[PDB]
Structure 1
Amino acid sequence: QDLSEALKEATKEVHIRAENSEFMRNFQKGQVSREGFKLVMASLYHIYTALEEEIERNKQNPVYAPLYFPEELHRRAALEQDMAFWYGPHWQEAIPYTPATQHYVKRLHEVGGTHPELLVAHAYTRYLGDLSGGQVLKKIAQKAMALPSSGEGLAFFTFPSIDNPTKFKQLYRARMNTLEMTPEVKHRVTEEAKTAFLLNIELFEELQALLTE
């Protein structure tokens, strides 16, 4: 079975759980506040910073390299734009770095530094989601918060080097399926993708509690 399929199958249950965290339930209903949106975007800033650091570290490593698409996919620059928008010109000292965010970053560094053959799990979990369900969440955030179509404040959700997310996502899948796979690697990849999803659930659980306080 192709890696792209094995990952979708392995994570379909946990994906249902992630969508039904209280934070994402409220988000999907159009209930997201500026405060709650700033917290989740700042946390994604740290997460994608760490993810992309480890991507760069491993760009030439054949357990990752066929998925090296910085121009198309990488989000750090976009997230920097969004931080300036939501937090102002001194955003680097204003933004929070929550403990659940720290925990996700920690595991990203463990994977990139000691288990790079699992980095595909983390890239899959973030980028493929960003290219599908992320586009729906974009439209909901725009409507909730009166964000302009010109795209300010939502750079994270915009892929100006990808014409068509559906076709790109098919290419990314196809390339995933060229990675050298053994039963060992494949089983651990799908396990790590479940962990990536849990790390996101745990963030959303944390941010909700911070917001409810």
Structure 2
Amino acid sequence: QDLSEALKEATKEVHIRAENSEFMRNFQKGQVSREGFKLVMASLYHIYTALEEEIERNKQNPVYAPLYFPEELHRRAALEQDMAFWYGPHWQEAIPYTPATQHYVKRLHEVGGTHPELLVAHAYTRYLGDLSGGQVLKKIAQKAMALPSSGEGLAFFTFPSIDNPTKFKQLYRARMNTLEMTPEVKHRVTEEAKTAFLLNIELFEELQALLT
């Protein structure tokens, strides 16, 4: 198969499980509070920071380089605005850094530092959902918490350098399909995408526990 198809098939079952975690079921129903939302967003701040640091480190490596779209995709600067919005001018002192977020960040550093050929698993898992279902959660969050259409507090979910999320996803898939790909790399990429989903599920189960 093509790498973009392999990855979609490989993660379709775990996507179903992730969508139905308690935290995400509550989110989807509009039951997301400012408390829960700040927890998850601060956690994403550390995750995208590590992911994008490792993307920087490996930007010239042919095992990742074709997916190098900082201007279009990178989320850290957006996450920093959201952090100043949600936690105030001293957000760096204030934001939580949970065990599950730490675990996800540590795997991101291992992949980026020792297994860069798997980095595409982690970019795929985060960015492509951001450009899909993340747009649906954005509308739900705005309605649940009364966030203005103008976008404050939801910069993470807004891609000002992408005209069309769907056409962009399609370009990105096509580029994923030009990575030099052996059966070895392909097997391990799809397995690493399953682990990335699990890391997100464990984050959700932890935030949920923290909230109840």
User: What band does the TM-score fall into relative to the shorter chain?
Assistant: over 0.9
Unmatched runs of 5 consecutive residues or more in structure 1: none
Find the counterpart in structure 2 of residue 94 from structure 1: 94
Deviation, structure 1 residue 119? 0.1
Deviation, structure 1 residue 114? 0.1
Deviation, structure 1 residue 175? 0.1
Structure 2 Cα separation of the partners of residues 181 and 23 of structure 1: 36
Deviation, structure 1 residue 112? 0.1
Structure 2 Cα separation of the partners of residues 103 and 169 of structure 1: 28
Structure 1 Cα separation of the partners of residues 192 and 166 of structure 2: 24
Structure 1 Cα separation of the partners of residues 131 and 174 of structure 2: 15
**Amino-acid identity (%):** 100
Cα deviation code 1:2-39 (max 9, x no counterpart):
00000000000000000000000000000000000000
Between the two proteins, the alignment pairs up a number of residues equal to 212
Deviation, structure 1 residue 126? 0.1
Cα deviation code 1:144-181 (max 9, x no counterpart):
00000000000000000000000000000000000000
Structure 2 Cα separation of the partners of residues 205 and 11 of structure 1: 19
Deviation, structure 1 residue 82? 0.0
Q: Secondary structure at the residue paired with 1:61?
A: coil
Cα deviation code 1:97-145 (max 9, x no counterpart):
0000000000000000000000000000000000000000000000000
Structure 1 Cα separation of the partners of residues 166 and 41 of structure 2: 24
Structure 2 Cα separation of the partners of residues 33 and 139 of structure 1: 14
Structure 1 Cα separation of the partners of residues 168 and 135 of structure 2: 14
Q: Secondary structure at the residue paired with 2:162?
A: coil
Find the counterpart in structure 1 of residue 26 from structure 2: 26
Deviation, structure 1 residue 209? 0.1
Cα deviation code 1:58-99 (max 9, x no counterpart):
000000000000000000000000000000000000000000
Find the counterpart in structure 2 of residue 8 from structure 1: 8
Find the counterpart in structure 2 of residue 202 from structure 1: 202
CA RMSD of aligned residues (A): 0.2
What are the equivalent positions in structure 2 for 1:60-209 lying under 5 Å apart?
A: 60-209=60-209
Deviation, structure 1 residue 193? 0.1
Q: Secondary structure at the residue paired with 1:30?
A: coil
Structure 1 Cα separation of the partners of residues 18 and 78 of structure 2: 24
Q: Displaced runs of 4+ in structure 1, greater than 6 A?
A: none
Q: Secondary structure at the residue paired with 1:149?
A: coil
Unmatched runs of 5 consecutive residues or more in structure 2: none
Deviation, structure 1 residue 40? 0.1
Structure 1 Cα separation of the partners of residues 207 and 99 of structure 2: 10
Structure 2 Cα separation of the partners of residues 119 and 83 of structure 1: 26
Structure 1 Cα separation of the partners of residues 10 and 59 of structure 2: 26
Deviation, structure 1 residue 56? 0.1
When the two structures are superposed, what TM-score results if normalisation uses the length of structure 2? Answer: 1.00
Structure 2 Cα separation of the partners of residues 12 and 202 of structure 1: 17
Q: Secondary structure at the residue paired with 1:199?
A: helix
